[PDB]
Structure 1
């Protein structure tokens, strides 16, 4: 189904970026940026400034370890989905 395809897409895209550098199960600043710029180009403005990268990570980093884990990525997805939902 389309729902099951959406579940596996969330897992795959996270790992496409998290496993690039350092901890393979977390997104660092540069990995989060590329994910937003390449995969969310219709929902979000392209990030071109360092302070936007820093602010976005600050917002998503719930436990405060400097990176975005899978749970925090899921919360980010929930935010975008809710913002898009309320648009209509």
Structure 2
């Protein structure tokens, strides 16, 4: 119900849980990114067992090519994976 406003605020809330975990509060390192994916998505998404998977994802999210995806880069990875959720979460 036009609840798009609560959805944007929640998307940002989870990001603060991991970004504030390490000094890169305003930036995410492929290392911090793995913790978001493996630890936060314990069962919601296929956990990552090898960091190499994160390196490949870095090619896609490492838009700046610095080995670190900025909070803006992290945000785009959440929209594409959700699209997959629509196939699984078929409302109906």
Q: How many residues align?
A: 88
Deviations 1:12-41 (A, max 9, x none): 111211122232111112211111123233
Does the 8 Å CA contact 1:15/1:25 hold for their aligned counterparts?
no
Task: Identify unmatched segments of 5+ residues in structure 2.
Answer: none
Higher strand share: 2
TM-score (norm 1): 0.78
Deviations 1:43-64 (A, max 9, x none): 4211111211222222211121
- The Cα RMSD (Å) is 2.1
Task: Identify unmatched segments of 5+ residues in structure 1.
Answer: none
Q: CA deviation at 1:87?
A: 4.4
TM-score (norm 2): 0.76
